[PDB]
Structure 1
Amino acid sequence: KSHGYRSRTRYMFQRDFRKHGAVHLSTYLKVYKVGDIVDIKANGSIQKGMPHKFYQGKTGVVYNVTKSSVGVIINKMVGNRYLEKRLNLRVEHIKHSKCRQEFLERVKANAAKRAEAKA
């Protein structure tokens, strides 16, 4: 009925199930990378590392790393045109990804030279 900045969020910005408090001090270790692709995922414990709604679920790529807890950024883009907007999120809210085919970049290249000598 009103349009405040967390509106509708009641279940999106949800929490847990039983993991209902306190950052996994792992989810806190780990190092960014002025290039590595991050995947937003808000968590009410924090609160800059709350990503203002829309950018929920959306995966992008670290463009800033103010690594002093200040997570990175990335952007993404949105509807009509895609005008890519950038958002400075915080270290406790973002997460890695499935660029995990570089595992198959490797698999490829390597197995492919072992294919050179093989052929």
Structure 2
Amino acid sequence: PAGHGLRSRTRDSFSRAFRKKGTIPLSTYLRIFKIGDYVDIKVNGAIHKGMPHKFYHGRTGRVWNVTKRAVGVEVNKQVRNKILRKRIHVRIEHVQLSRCTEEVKERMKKNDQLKAEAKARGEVISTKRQPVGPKPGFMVEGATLETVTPIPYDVVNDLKGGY
């Protein structure tokens, strides 16, 4: 409405991948969705029912409801000077389980194990990971050195493959 249809400017967004049209693989319908799961919204152009608005395409949200064929997703949306947690319902064909938190549980388990080991030996440690820092000094074995010099200019080589 108001000068723009629901699917305006979706020629590329809602189109299917090259040589990937037709029947949908069964893995899409065999997935399990539960409350609190993070999902990625990817519109399947062949499924016209339960289609999210184009804005939510390419955005990640959290599952808050589970119906027979669709799943409720809460997606942040910036409107002027605030963020709105807009709740939508989307069919499972248009949604994929997100990997944005795949390493969290593993890291927590390893941190707990390390903390328990440190407590056993009576030491205090920090399990926080750190950004890559400066490397220490080291010795590099001498080898044959190849000299690099600027190339004399030749106009005939200005074209790819030569003039």
TM-score interval, normalised by the smaller of the two chains: 0.7 to 0.9
Deviation at 1:110, TM superposition (A): 2.6
Aligned to 2:8: 7
Which consecutive unaligned segments of at least 5 residues does structure 2 have? 124-163
Q: Which runs of 4+ in 1 moved over 3 A?
A: 114-119
Aligned to 1:106: 109
Contact 2:36 2:63 survives alignment (8 Å): yes
Flag the structure with larger Rg: 2
Q: Does the alignment pair 1:77 with 2:77?
A: yes
Whole-angstrom CA distance in 2 between matches of 1:42 and 1:25: 17
Which consecutive unaligned segments of at least 5 residues does structure 1 have? none
Contact 2:59 2:75 survives alignment (8 Å): no
SS at match of 1:92: helix
2:75 maps to amino acid: N
Bigger proportion of residues as strand: 2
Whole-angstrom CA distance in 2 between matches of 1:88 and 1:42: 13
The 5 Å alignment of 1:1-119 reads 3-66=4-67, 68-80=68-80, 81-97=82-98, 98-102=100-104, 103-117=106-120, 119=123
Deviation at 1:49, TM superposition (A): 4.0
- Give the aligned length: 117
Whole-angstrom CA distance in 2 between matches of 1:54 and 1:13: 11
- Bigger drift between 20-29 and 103-112 goes to 103-112
TM-score, normalized by length of structure 1?
Answer: 0.85
Whole-angstrom CA distance in 2 between matches of 1:7 and 1:31: 32
- The sequence identity of aligned pairs, in percent, is 44
- RMSD between aligned alpha carbons? 1.8
TM-score, normalized by length of structure 2?
Answer: 0.64
Instruction: Check 1:17–1:111 CA distance in 2 against 1; reply closer, same or farther (3 A cut).
Output: farther
2:62 maps to amino acid: V
